[PDB]
Amino acid sequence: FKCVNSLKEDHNQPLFGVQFNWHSKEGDPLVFATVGSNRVTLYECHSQGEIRLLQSYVDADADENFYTCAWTYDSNTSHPLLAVAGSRGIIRIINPITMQCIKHYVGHGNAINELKFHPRDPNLLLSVSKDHALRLWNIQTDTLVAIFGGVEGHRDEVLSADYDLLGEKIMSCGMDHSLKLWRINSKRMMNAIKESYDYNPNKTNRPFISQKIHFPDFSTRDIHRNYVDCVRWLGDLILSKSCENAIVCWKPGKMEDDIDKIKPSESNVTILGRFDYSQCDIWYMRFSMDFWQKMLALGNQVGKLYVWDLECTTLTHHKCGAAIRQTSFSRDSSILIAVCDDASIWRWDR
Ligand SMILES: CS(=O)(=O)c1ccc(-c2cnc(NCc3cccc4c3CCO4)n3cnnc23)cc1
């Protein structure tokens, strides 16, 4: 990788999130979104390192702080859509052509830390909050499918979550040092998703009733000893990090235990590997993987970018010295974008 371009957003506030749109066809524009302050901005990647500003969404509330964004598509037209959320605890669905808000969802009792779309169903949106819960929404029928939390749920702010390859289960993590598994291919959850598609408030005077999921299907606090701020699946294995200068590769149960045989009472975990690094000991730093899960990237608090081949390279620039909060690879893994605390954006080409 070589640094081919850099820019700074006029607001001068930290950029907390970045995502390339992985739903665009080959030959169509390569676009990424950034979130920081009360803004969402779209950019296009052109040849010879060129980055073109497309449009921006500026929230009516000057005190809103966006923390996360995620891309999906309309199941009938295949047109892209962008979801954004932050400190207000309000989810906004944005049309990327006009950069206008189509609709919004209220409900979480505090800030939203991460948004993720289901890998098979573009209408199923997962949100994780400071209110200690996860929520699953159906954005086609505007319904709240389920709330994951309660008696055996997280006992402090939830920081991250990820669906597995097929979207049969979710792993969540947060300030309580725990990683919790929630199966969504159960008879109860499959029926609830089916019912959310049948609901229409114009054909009944009764409200849609959400599932209250009080119990996870697995839980551990034995991987990290501080806030767990990023989790991703790697097949049936899990990659997770805290502020302790390592990404840990682990699995529930003993070495030969199959993930789908794991019982909620499972007391063991198996450590498989560790990715060690330096100067990344502050809260709120995300790692990412490329589409094919062959590359892993993480920025540090002094502007250095670490890249591992999953099948370590340190990327540095004399003008890049602020904390790198999140990174994103283009679908073909030829471009890597990094966003910083000083509102700067960095483009690395392979
Ligand atoms: C410049 S400062 O004032 O020191 C500062 C630093 C960080 C944050 C901050 C960042 N991001 C999140 N939330 C979502 C997010 C964004 C990125 C990575 C990440 C997560 C959750 C896990 O990892 N924040 C939620 N509440 N505060 C923050 C706020 C102020």
Side-chain angles (χ1 to χ4, degrees), residues 7 9 15 17-21 29-34 41-45 50-52 54-55 69 71 82 328-330 335 337-339 345-347:
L7 72 135
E9 294 194 350
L15 292 174
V18 60
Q19 306 285 346
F20 266 97
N21 175 17
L30 282 178
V31 174
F32 68 90
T34 66
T41 310
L42 301 192
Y43 296 95
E44 191 180 342
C45 284
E50 183 185 356
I51 299 158
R52 191 176 294 156
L54 294 177
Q55 255 163 301
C69 73
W71 293 93
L82 181 71
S328 185
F329 287 96
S330 63
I335 306 168
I337 294 283
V339 303
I345 302 166
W346 301 80
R347 184 181 160 173

PDB file of all heavy atoms in Angstrom, residues 7 9 15 17-21 29-34 41-45 50-52 54-55 69 71 82 328-330 335 337-339 345-347:
ATOM      1  N   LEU A   7      -7.333  14.470   2.848  1.00  0.00           N
ATOM      2  CA  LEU A   7      -8.142  15.687   2.957  1.00  0.00           C
ATOM      3  C   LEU A   7      -8.632  15.870   4.396  1.00  0.00           C
ATOM      4  O   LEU A   7      -8.467  14.961   5.208  1.00  0.00           O
ATOM      5  CB  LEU A   7      -9.300  15.708   1.934  1.00  0.00           C
ATOM      6  CG  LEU A   7     -10.473  14.766   2.174  1.00  0.00           C
ATOM      7  CD1 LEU A   7     -11.795  15.479   1.951  1.00  0.00           C
ATOM      8  CD2 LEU A   7     -10.366  13.533   1.300  1.00  0.00           C
ATOM      9  N   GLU A   9     -12.120  17.484   6.768  1.00  0.00           N
ATOM     10  CA  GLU A   9     -13.491  18.002   6.728  1.00  0.00           C
ATOM     11  C   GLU A   9     -13.527  19.361   7.455  1.00  0.00           C
ATOM     12  O   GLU A   9     -12.880  19.504   8.493  1.00  0.00           O
ATOM     13  CB  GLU A   9     -14.492  16.986   7.296  1.00  0.00           C
ATOM     14  CG  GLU A   9     -14.593  15.745   6.424  1.00  0.00           C
ATOM     15  CD  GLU A   9     -15.755  14.795   6.649  1.00  0.00           C
ATOM     16  OE1 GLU A   9     -16.483  14.944   7.654  1.00  0.00           O
ATOM     17  OE2 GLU A   9     -15.929  13.883   5.812  1.00  0.00           O
ATOM     18  N   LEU A  15     -13.685  12.153  13.376  1.00  0.00           N
ATOM     19  CA  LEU A  15     -14.464  11.276  12.503  1.00  0.00           C
ATOM     20  C   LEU A  15     -14.446   9.906  13.185  1.00  0.00           C
ATOM     21  O   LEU A  15     -13.365   9.356  13.436  1.00  0.00           O
ATOM     22  CB  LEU A  15     -13.881  11.215  11.077  1.00  0.00           C
ATOM     23  CG  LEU A  15     -13.990  12.519  10.256  1.00  0.00           C
ATOM     24  CD1 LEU A  15     -13.248  12.393   8.940  1.00  0.00           C
ATOM     25  CD2 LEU A  15     -15.454  12.875   9.967  1.00  0.00           C
ATOM     26  N   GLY A  17     -16.502   7.129  12.221  1.00  0.00           N
ATOM     27  CA  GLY A  17     -16.874   6.004  11.368  1.00  0.00           C
ATOM     28  C   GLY A  17     -16.667   6.233   9.890  1.00  0.00           C
ATOM     29  O   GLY A  17     -16.748   7.362   9.415  1.00  0.00           O
ATOM     30  N   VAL A  18     -16.403   5.133   9.157  1.00  0.00           N
ATOM     31  CA  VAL A  18     -16.207   5.141   7.706  1.00  0.00           C
ATOM     32  C   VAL A  18     -16.641   3.782   7.143  1.00  0.00           C
ATOM     33  O   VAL A  18     -16.311   2.742   7.727  1.00  0.00           O
ATOM     34  CB  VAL A  18     -14.769   5.551   7.258  1.00  0.00           C
ATOM     35  CG1 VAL A  18     -13.693   4.597   7.807  1.00  0.00           C
ATOM     36  CG2 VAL A  18     -14.675   5.682   5.735  1.00  0.00           C
ATOM     37  N   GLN A  19     -17.400   3.794   6.022  1.00  0.00           N
ATOM     38  CA  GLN A  19     -17.854   2.568   5.369  1.00  0.00           C
ATOM     39  C   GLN A  19     -17.927   2.729   3.843  1.00  0.00           C
ATOM     40  O   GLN A  19     -18.671   3.591   3.359  1.00  0.00           O
ATOM     41  CB  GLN A  19     -19.269   2.152   5.865  1.00  0.00           C
ATOM     42  CG  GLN A  19     -19.491   2.009   7.383  1.00  0.00           C
ATOM     43  CD  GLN A  19     -18.890   0.757   8.001  1.00  0.00           C
ATOM     44  OE1 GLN A  19     -18.503  -0.186   7.304  1.00  0.00           O
ATOM     45  NE2 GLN A  19     -18.807   0.713   9.313  1.00  0.00           N
ATOM     46  N   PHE A  20     -17.239   1.843   3.092  1.00  0.00           N
ATOM     47  CA  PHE A  20     -17.408   1.772   1.639  1.00  0.00           C
ATOM     48  C   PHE A  20     -18.751   1.078   1.388  1.00  0.00           C
ATOM     49  O   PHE A  20     -19.170   0.231   2.200  1.00  0.00           O
ATOM     50  CB  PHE A  20     -16.313   0.924   0.969  1.00  0.00           C
ATOM     51  CG  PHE A  20     -15.126   1.703   0.448  1.00  0.00           C
ATOM     52  CD1 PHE A  20     -13.968   1.824   1.210  1.00  0.00           C
ATOM     53  CD2 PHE A  20     -15.161   2.305  -0.813  1.00  0.00           C
ATOM     54  CE1 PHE A  20     -12.859   2.527   0.724  1.00  0.00           C
ATOM     55  CE2 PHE A  20     -14.053   3.010  -1.302  1.00  0.00           C
ATOM     56  CZ  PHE A  20     -12.911   3.126  -0.520  1.00  0.00           C
ATOM     57  N   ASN A  21     -19.429   1.455   0.286  1.00  0.00           N
ATOM     58  CA  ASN A  21     -20.678   0.821  -0.134  1.00  0.00           C
ATOM     59  C   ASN A  21     -20.268  -0.441  -0.902  1.00  0.00           C
ATOM     60  O   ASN A  21     -19.745  -0.334  -2.019  1.00  0.00           O
ATOM     61  CB  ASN A  21     -21.509   1.749  -1.057  1.00  0.00           C
ATOM     62  CG  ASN A  21     -22.763   1.073  -1.606  1.00  0.00           C
ATOM     63  OD1 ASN A  21     -23.225   0.041  -1.089  1.00  0.00           O
ATOM     64  ND2 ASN A  21     -23.341   1.633  -2.673  1.00  0.00           N
ATOM     65  N   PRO A  29     -19.836   3.764  -9.731  1.00  0.00           N
ATOM     66  CA  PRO A  29     -18.998   4.560  -8.812  1.00  0.00           C
ATOM     67  C   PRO A  29     -18.601   3.901  -7.488  1.00  0.00           C
ATOM     68  O   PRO A  29     -19.451   3.283  -6.853  1.00  0.00           O
ATOM     69  CB  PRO A  29     -19.855   5.808  -8.564  1.00  0.00           C
ATOM     70  CG  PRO A  29     -20.688   5.942  -9.801  1.00  0.00           C
ATOM     71  CD  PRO A  29     -21.040   4.524 -10.140  1.00  0.00           C
ATOM     72  N   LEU A  30     -17.309   4.021  -7.089  1.00  0.00           N
ATOM     73  CA  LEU A  30     -16.794   3.517  -5.805  1.00  0.00           C
ATOM     74  C   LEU A  30     -17.014   4.630  -4.791  1.00  0.00           C
ATOM     75  O   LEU A  30     -16.372   5.674  -4.884  1.00  0.00           O
ATOM     76  CB  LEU A  30     -15.295   3.160  -5.864  1.00  0.00           C
ATOM     77  CG  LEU A  30     -14.897   1.844  -6.528  1.00  0.00           C
ATOM     78  CD1 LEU A  30     -13.371   1.691  -6.529  1.00  0.00           C
ATOM     79  CD2 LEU A  30     -15.509   0.641  -5.797  1.00  0.00           C
ATOM     80  N   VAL A  31     -17.949   4.427  -3.860  1.00  0.00           N
ATOM     81  CA  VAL A  31     -18.366   5.433  -2.881  1.00  0.00           C
ATOM     82  C   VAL A  31     -18.177   4.951  -1.430  1.00  0.00           C
ATOM     83  O   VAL A  31     -18.386   3.769  -1.127  1.00  0.00           O
ATOM     84  CB  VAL A  31     -19.853   5.837  -3.175  1.00  0.00           C
ATOM     85  CG1 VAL A  31     -20.425   6.778  -2.122  1.00  0.00           C
ATOM     86  CG2 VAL A  31     -20.004   6.455  -4.570  1.00  0.00           C
ATOM     87  N   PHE A  32     -17.789   5.890  -0.535  1.00  0.00           N
ATOM     88  CA  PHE A  32     -17.685   5.658   0.907  1.00  0.00           C
ATOM     89  C   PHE A  32     -18.346   6.798   1.673  1.00  0.00           C
ATOM     90  O   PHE A  32     -18.413   7.926   1.162  1.00  0.00           O
ATOM     91  CB  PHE A  32     -16.231   5.416   1.384  1.00  0.00           C
ATOM     92  CG  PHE A  32     -15.268   6.582   1.309  1.00  0.00           C
ATOM     93  CD1 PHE A  32     -15.120   7.450   2.383  1.00  0.00           C
ATOM     94  CD2 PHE A  32     -14.467   6.771   0.186  1.00  0.00           C
ATOM     95  CE1 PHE A  32     -14.215   8.519   2.321  1.00  0.00           C
ATOM     96  CE2 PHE A  32     -13.561   7.840   0.123  1.00  0.00           C
ATOM     97  CZ  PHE A  32     -13.440   8.704   1.193  1.00  0.00           C
ATOM     98  N   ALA A  33     -18.848   6.500   2.879  1.00  0.00           N
ATOM     99  CA  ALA A  33     -19.485   7.481   3.766  1.00  0.00           C
ATOM    100  C   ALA A  33     -18.630   7.668   5.020  1.00  0.00           C
ATOM    101  O   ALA A  33     -18.027   6.702   5.495  1.00  0.00           O
ATOM    102  CB  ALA A  33     -20.882   6.999   4.168  1.00  0.00           C
ATOM    103  N   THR A  34     -18.585   8.905   5.565  1.00  0.00           N
ATOM    104  CA  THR A  34     -17.882   9.217   6.816  1.00  0.00           C
ATOM    105  C   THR A  34     -18.895   9.827   7.793  1.00  0.00           C
ATOM    106  O   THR A  34     -19.813  10.530   7.354  1.00  0.00           O
ATOM    107  CB  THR A  34     -16.716  10.227   6.615  1.00  0.00           C
ATOM    108  OG1 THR A  34     -17.247  11.499   6.218  1.00  0.00           O
ATOM    109  CG2 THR A  34     -15.648   9.736   5.641  1.00  0.00           C
ATOM    110  N   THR A  41     -21.156  12.330   5.337  1.00  0.00           N
ATOM    111  CA  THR A  41     -20.634  12.821   4.048  1.00  0.00           C
ATOM    112  C   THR A  41     -20.304  11.682   3.082  1.00  0.00           C
ATOM    113  O   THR A  41     -19.699  10.688   3.498  1.00  0.00           O
ATOM    114  CB  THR A  41     -19.417  13.756   4.298  1.00  0.00           C
ATOM    115  OG1 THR A  41     -19.764  14.739   5.277  1.00  0.00           O
ATOM    116  CG2 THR A  41     -18.954  14.479   3.046  1.00  0.00           C
ATOM    117  N   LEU A  42     -20.669  11.846   1.784  1.00  0.00           N
ATOM    118  CA  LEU A  42     -20.384  10.863   0.738  1.00  0.00           C
ATOM    119  C   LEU A  42     -19.262  11.338  -0.175  1.00  0.00           C
ATOM    120  O   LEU A  42     -19.243  12.506  -0.583  1.00  0.00           O
ATOM    121  CB  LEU A  42     -21.630  10.528  -0.110  1.00  0.00           C
ATOM    122  CG  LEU A  42     -22.877   9.955   0.576  1.00  0.00           C
ATOM    123  CD1 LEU A  42     -23.862   9.425  -0.467  1.00  0.00           C
ATOM    124  CD2 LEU A  42     -22.537   8.834   1.555  1.00  0.00           C
ATOM    125  N   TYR A  43     -18.354  10.412  -0.525  1.00  0.00           N
ATOM    126  CA  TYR A  43     -17.205  10.658  -1.399  1.00  0.00           C
ATOM    127  C   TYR A  43     -17.090   9.584  -2.460  1.00  0.00           C
ATOM    128  O   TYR A  43     -17.393   8.418  -2.189  1.00  0.00           O
ATOM    129  CB  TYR A  43     -15.900  10.637  -0.589  1.00  0.00           C
ATOM    130  CG  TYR A  43     -15.776  11.725   0.452  1.00  0.00           C
ATOM    131  CD1 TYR A  43     -16.142  11.495   1.775  1.00  0.00           C
ATOM    132  CD2 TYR A  43     -15.233  12.965   0.131  1.00  0.00           C
ATOM    133  CE1 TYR A  43     -15.996  12.483   2.747  1.00  0.00           C
ATOM    134  CE2 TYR A  43     -15.090  13.962   1.092  1.00  0.00           C
ATOM    135  CZ  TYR A  43     -15.466  13.717   2.400  1.00  0.00           C
ATOM    136  OH  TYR A  43     -15.320  14.709   3.338  1.00  0.00           O
ATOM    137  N   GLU A  44     -16.562   9.957  -3.633  1.00  0.00           N
ATOM    138  CA  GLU A  44     -16.306   9.013  -4.713  1.00  0.00           C
ATOM    139  C   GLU A  44     -14.793   8.871  -4.957  1.00  0.00           C
ATOM    140  O   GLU A  44     -14.083   9.877  -5.021  1.00  0.00           O
ATOM    141  CB  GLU A  44     -17.033   9.441  -6.004  1.00  0.00           C
ATOM    142  CG  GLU A  44     -17.010   8.359  -7.073  1.00  0.00           C
ATOM    143  CD  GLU A  44     -17.703   8.661  -8.390  1.00  0.00           C
ATOM    144  OE1 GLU A  44     -18.532   9.599  -8.440  1.00  0.00           O
ATOM    145  OE2 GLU A  44     -17.423   7.944  -9.376  1.00  0.00           O
ATOM    146  N   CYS A  45     -14.309   7.620  -5.096  1.00  0.00           N
ATOM    147  CA  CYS A  45     -12.908   7.312  -5.391  1.00  0.00           C
ATOM    148  C   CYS A  45     -12.710   7.199  -6.900  1.00  0.00           C
ATOM    149  O   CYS A  45     -13.333   6.342  -7.543  1.00  0.00           O
ATOM    150  CB  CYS A  45     -12.468   6.032  -4.683  1.00  0.00           C
ATOM    151  SG  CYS A  45     -12.169   6.233  -2.911  1.00  0.00           S
ATOM    152  N   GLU A  50      -7.579  10.473  -6.840  1.00  0.00           N
ATOM    153  CA  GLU A  50      -8.620  11.506  -6.711  1.00  0.00           C
ATOM    154  C   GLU A  50      -9.823  11.070  -5.856  1.00  0.00           C
ATOM    155  O   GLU A  50     -10.335   9.966  -6.031  1.00  0.00           O
ATOM    156  CB  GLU A  50      -9.075  11.985  -8.109  1.00  0.00           C
ATOM    157  CG  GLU A  50     -10.095  13.119  -8.103  1.00  0.00           C
ATOM    158  CD  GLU A  50     -10.672  13.544  -9.443  1.00  0.00           C
ATOM    159  OE1 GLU A  50     -10.241  13.009 -10.490  1.00  0.00           O
ATOM    160  OE2 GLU A  50     -11.563  14.422  -9.441  1.00  0.00           O
ATOM    161  N   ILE A  51     -10.248  11.951  -4.926  1.00  0.00           N
ATOM    162  CA  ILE A  51     -11.400  11.791  -4.031  1.00  0.00           C
ATOM    163  C   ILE A  51     -12.317  12.996  -4.285  1.00  0.00           C
ATOM    164  O   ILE A  51     -11.894  14.140  -4.093  1.00  0.00           O
ATOM    165  CB  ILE A  51     -10.991  11.685  -2.528  1.00  0.00           C
ATOM    166  CG1 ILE A  51     -10.080  10.463  -2.260  1.00  0.00           C
ATOM    167  CG2 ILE A  51     -12.239  11.663  -1.618  1.00  0.00           C
ATOM    168  CD1 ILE A  51      -9.220  10.571  -0.974  1.00  0.00           C
ATOM    169  N   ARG A  52     -13.548  12.740  -4.739  1.00  0.00           N
ATOM    170  CA  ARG A  52     -14.518  13.790  -5.046  1.00  0.00           C
ATOM    171  C   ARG A  52     -15.648  13.828  -4.024  1.00  0.00           C
ATOM    172  O   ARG A  52     -16.288  12.802  -3.768  1.00  0.00           O
ATOM    173  CB  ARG A  52     -15.080  13.590  -6.467  1.00  0.00           C
ATOM    174  CG  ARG A  52     -15.896  14.766  -6.991  1.00  0.00           C
ATOM    175  CD  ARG A  52     -16.346  14.582  -8.424  1.00  0.00           C
ATOM    176  NE  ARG A  52     -15.226  14.570  -9.362  1.00  0.00           N
ATOM    177  CZ  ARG A  52     -15.252  13.998 -10.561  1.00  0.00           C
ATOM    178  NH1 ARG A  52     -16.343  13.362 -10.979  1.00  0.00           N
ATOM    179  NH2 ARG A  52     -14.187  14.044 -11.346  1.00  0.00           N
ATOM    180  N   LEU A  54     -19.226  14.302  -2.860  1.00  0.00           N
ATOM    181  CA  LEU A  54     -20.515  14.142  -3.539  1.00  0.00           C
ATOM    182  C   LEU A  54     -21.640  14.973  -2.926  1.00  0.00           C
ATOM    183  O   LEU A  54     -22.221  15.811  -3.619  1.00  0.00           O
ATOM    184  CB  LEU A  54     -20.933  12.664  -3.655  1.00  0.00           C
ATOM    185  CG  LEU A  54     -20.080  11.748  -4.533  1.00  0.00           C
ATOM    186  CD1 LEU A  54     -20.595  10.328  -4.469  1.00  0.00           C
ATOM    187  CD2 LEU A  54     -20.042  12.227  -5.991  1.00  0.00           C
ATOM    188  N   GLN A  55     -21.957  14.729  -1.642  1.00  0.00           N
ATOM    189  CA  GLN A  55     -23.022  15.401  -0.897  1.00  0.00           C
ATOM    190  C   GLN A  55     -22.864  15.158   0.599  1.00  0.00           C
ATOM    191  O   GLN A  55     -22.137  14.251   1.002  1.00  0.00           O
ATOM    192  CB  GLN A  55     -24.401  14.878  -1.349  1.00  0.00           C
ATOM    193  CG  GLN A  55     -25.186  15.835  -2.228  1.00  0.00           C
ATOM    194  CD  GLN A  55     -26.296  15.119  -2.949  1.00  0.00           C
ATOM    195  OE1 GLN A  55     -26.067  14.174  -3.715  1.00  0.00           O
ATOM    196  NE2 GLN A  55     -27.522  15.563  -2.718  1.00  0.00           N
ATOM    197  N   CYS A  69     -22.425   4.266  10.962  1.00  0.00           N
ATOM    198  CA  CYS A  69     -23.228   4.221   9.741  1.00  0.00           C
ATOM    199  C   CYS A  69     -23.120   2.831   9.099  1.00  0.00           C
ATOM    200  O   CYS A  69     -22.173   2.090   9.397  1.00  0.00           O
ATOM    201  CB  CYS A  69     -22.894   5.347   8.763  1.00  0.00           C
ATOM    202  SG  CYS A  69     -21.311   5.152   7.915  1.00  0.00           S
ATOM    203  N   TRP A  71     -24.522   0.507   5.269  1.00  0.00           N
ATOM    204  CA  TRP A  71     -25.205   0.494   3.967  1.00  0.00           C
ATOM    205  C   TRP A  71     -26.119  -0.728   3.790  1.00  0.00           C
ATOM    206  O   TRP A  71     -25.810  -1.820   4.255  1.00  0.00           O
ATOM    207  CB  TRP A  71     -24.176   0.441   2.822  1.00  0.00           C
ATOM    208  CG  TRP A  71     -23.310   1.660   2.653  1.00  0.00           C
ATOM    209  CD1 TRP A  71     -22.077   1.875   3.205  1.00  0.00           C
ATOM    210  CD2 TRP A  71     -23.567   2.782   1.794  1.00  0.00           C
ATOM    211  NE1 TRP A  71     -21.554   3.071   2.753  1.00  0.00           N
ATOM    212  CE2 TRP A  71     -22.449   3.653   1.894  1.00  0.00           C
ATOM    213  CE3 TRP A  71     -24.644   3.146   0.968  1.00  0.00           C
ATOM    214  CZ2 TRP A  71     -22.374   4.865   1.188  1.00  0.00           C
ATOM    215  CZ3 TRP A  71     -24.569   4.344   0.262  1.00  0.00           C
ATOM    216  CH2 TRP A  71     -23.443   5.188   0.377  1.00  0.00           C
ATOM    217  N   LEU A  82     -28.610   4.295   3.214  1.00  0.00           N
ATOM    218  CA  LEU A  82     -27.632   4.474   4.291  1.00  0.00           C
ATOM    219  C   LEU A  82     -28.304   4.763   5.641  1.00  0.00           C
ATOM    220  O   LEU A  82     -29.131   5.664   5.732  1.00  0.00           O
ATOM    221  CB  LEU A  82     -26.636   5.602   3.915  1.00  0.00           C
ATOM    222  CG  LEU A  82     -25.496   5.933   4.902  1.00  0.00           C
ATOM    223  CD1 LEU A  82     -24.451   4.823   4.942  1.00  0.00           C
ATOM    224  CD2 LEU A  82     -24.828   7.236   4.516  1.00  0.00           C
ATOM    225  N   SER A 328     -11.773   1.376   6.372  1.00  0.00           N
ATOM    226  CA  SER A 328     -12.644   0.617   5.471  1.00  0.00           C
ATOM    227  C   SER A 328     -11.934   0.273   4.163  1.00  0.00           C
ATOM    228  O   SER A 328     -11.301   1.141   3.547  1.00  0.00           O
ATOM    229  CB  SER A 328     -13.942   1.364   5.177  1.00  0.00           C
ATOM    230  OG  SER A 328     -14.821   0.565   4.387  1.00  0.00           O
ATOM    231  N   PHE A 329     -12.041  -1.006   3.751  1.00  0.00           N
ATOM    232  CA  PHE A 329     -11.488  -1.468   2.484  1.00  0.00           C
ATOM    233  C   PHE A 329     -12.579  -1.374   1.413  1.00  0.00           C
ATOM    234  O   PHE A 329     -13.754  -1.632   1.712  1.00  0.00           O
ATOM    235  CB  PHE A 329     -11.065  -2.958   2.579  1.00  0.00           C
ATOM    236  CG  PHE A 329      -9.823  -3.292   3.367  1.00  0.00           C
ATOM    237  CD1 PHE A 329      -9.910  -3.686   4.699  1.00  0.00           C
ATOM    238  CD2 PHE A 329      -8.568  -3.255   2.764  1.00  0.00           C
ATOM    239  CE1 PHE A 329      -8.755  -4.019   5.421  1.00  0.00           C
ATOM    240  CE2 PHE A 329      -7.413  -3.574   3.488  1.00  0.00           C
ATOM    241  CZ  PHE A 329      -7.516  -3.968   4.803  1.00  0.00           C
ATOM    242  N   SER A 330     -12.187  -1.066   0.151  1.00  0.00           N
ATOM    243  CA  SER A 330     -13.107  -1.106  -0.987  1.00  0.00           C
ATOM    244  C   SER A 330     -13.402  -2.593  -1.208  1.00  0.00           C
ATOM    245  O   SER A 330     -12.597  -3.440  -0.792  1.00  0.00           O
ATOM    246  CB  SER A 330     -12.458  -0.502  -2.235  1.00  0.00           C
ATOM    247  OG  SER A 330     -11.323  -1.246  -2.653  1.00  0.00           O
ATOM    248  N   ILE A 335      -8.282  -0.473  -2.313  1.00  0.00           N
ATOM    249  CA  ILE A 335      -8.243   0.813  -1.596  1.00  0.00           C
ATOM    250  C   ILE A 335      -8.533   0.604  -0.101  1.00  0.00           C
ATOM    251  O   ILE A 335      -9.430  -0.163   0.248  1.00  0.00           O
ATOM    252  CB  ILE A 335      -9.221   1.871  -2.227  1.00  0.00           C
ATOM    253  CG1 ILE A 335      -8.972   2.067  -3.749  1.00  0.00           C
ATOM    254  CG2 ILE A 335      -9.152   3.223  -1.480  1.00  0.00           C
ATOM    255  CD1 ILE A 335     -10.085   2.872  -4.505  1.00  0.00           C
ATOM    256  N   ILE A 337      -9.231   3.169   3.272  1.00  0.00           N
ATOM    257  CA  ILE A 337      -9.480   4.528   3.790  1.00  0.00           C
ATOM    258  C   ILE A 337      -9.394   4.527   5.335  1.00  0.00           C
ATOM    259  O   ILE A 337     -10.001   3.667   5.981  1.00  0.00           O
ATOM    260  CB  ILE A 337     -10.864   5.071   3.300  1.00  0.00           C
ATOM    261  CG1 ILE A 337     -10.903   5.282   1.755  1.00  0.00           C
ATOM    262  CG2 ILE A 337     -11.307   6.335   4.077  1.00  0.00           C
ATOM    263  CD1 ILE A 337     -10.195   6.551   1.184  1.00  0.00           C
ATOM    264  N   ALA A 338      -8.684   5.519   5.920  1.00  0.00           N
ATOM    265  CA  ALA A 338      -8.561   5.693   7.374  1.00  0.00           C
ATOM    266  C   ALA A 338      -9.076   7.088   7.763  1.00  0.00           C
ATOM    267  O   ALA A 338      -8.794   8.057   7.046  1.00  0.00           O
ATOM    268  CB  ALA A 338      -7.106   5.545   7.809  1.00  0.00           C
ATOM    269  N   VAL A 339      -9.857   7.186   8.868  1.00  0.00           N
ATOM    270  CA  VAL A 339     -10.425   8.464   9.350  1.00  0.00           C
ATOM    271  C   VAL A 339      -9.919   8.778  10.775  1.00  0.00           C
ATOM    272  O   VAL A 339      -9.752   7.853  11.587  1.00  0.00           O
ATOM    273  CB  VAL A 339     -11.970   8.572   9.196  1.00  0.00           C
ATOM    274  CG1 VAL A 339     -12.401   8.374   7.734  1.00  0.00           C
ATOM    275  CG2 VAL A 339     -12.708   7.590  10.114  1.00  0.00           C
ATOM    276  N   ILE A 345      -8.930  12.453   6.430  1.00  0.00           N
ATOM    277  CA  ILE A 345      -9.228  11.219   5.690  1.00  0.00           C
ATOM    278  C   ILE A 345      -7.966  10.867   4.907  1.00  0.00           C
ATOM    279  O   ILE A 345      -7.406  11.744   4.250  1.00  0.00           O
ATOM    280  CB  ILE A 345     -10.462  11.439   4.748  1.00  0.00           C
ATOM    281  CG1 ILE A 345     -11.716  11.881   5.542  1.00  0.00           C
ATOM    282  CG2 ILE A 345     -10.745  10.208   3.865  1.00  0.00           C
ATOM    283  CD1 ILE A 345     -12.892  12.444   4.706  1.00  0.00           C
ATOM    284  N   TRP A 346      -7.529   9.593   4.964  1.00  0.00           N
ATOM    285  CA  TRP A 346      -6.298   9.109   4.316  1.00  0.00           C
ATOM    286  C   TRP A 346      -6.587   7.955   3.354  1.00  0.00           C
ATOM    287  O   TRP A 346      -7.257   6.997   3.744  1.00  0.00           O
ATOM    288  CB  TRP A 346      -5.259   8.704   5.387  1.00  0.00           C
ATOM    289  CG  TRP A 346      -4.908   9.850   6.292  1.00  0.00           C
ATOM    290  CD1 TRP A 346      -5.631  10.298   7.360  1.00  0.00           C
ATOM    291  CD2 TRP A 346      -3.826  10.780   6.118  1.00  0.00           C
ATOM    292  NE1 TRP A 346      -5.073  11.456   7.856  1.00  0.00           N
ATOM    293  CE2 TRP A 346      -3.962  11.773   7.119  1.00  0.00           C
ATOM    294  CE3 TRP A 346      -2.733  10.856   5.232  1.00  0.00           C
ATOM    295  CZ2 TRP A 346      -3.054  12.839   7.247  1.00  0.00           C
ATOM    296  CZ3 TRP A 346      -1.832  11.914   5.360  1.00  0.00           C
ATOM    297  CH2 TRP A 346      -1.987  12.880   6.369  1.00  0.00           C
ATOM    298  N   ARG A 347      -6.109   8.058   2.092  1.00  0.00           N
ATOM    299  CA  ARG A 347      -6.329   7.030   1.064  1.00  0.00           C
ATOM    300  C   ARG A 347      -5.039   6.271   0.750  1.00  0.00           C
ATOM    301  O   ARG A 347      -4.051   6.875   0.323  1.00  0.00           O
ATOM    302  CB  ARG A 347      -6.941   7.631  -0.227  1.00  0.00           C
ATOM    303  CG  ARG A 347      -7.270   6.570  -1.290  1.00  0.00           C
ATOM    304  CD  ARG A 347      -7.842   7.166  -2.561  1.00  0.00           C
ATOM    305  NE  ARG A 347      -7.710   6.234  -3.683  1.00  0.00           N
ATOM    306  CZ  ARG A 347      -8.237   6.422  -4.890  1.00  0.00           C
ATOM    307  NH1 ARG A 347      -8.963   7.505  -5.147  1.00  0.00           N
ATOM    308  NH2 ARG A 347      -8.040   5.531  -5.855  1.00  0.00           N
TER     309      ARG A 347
END
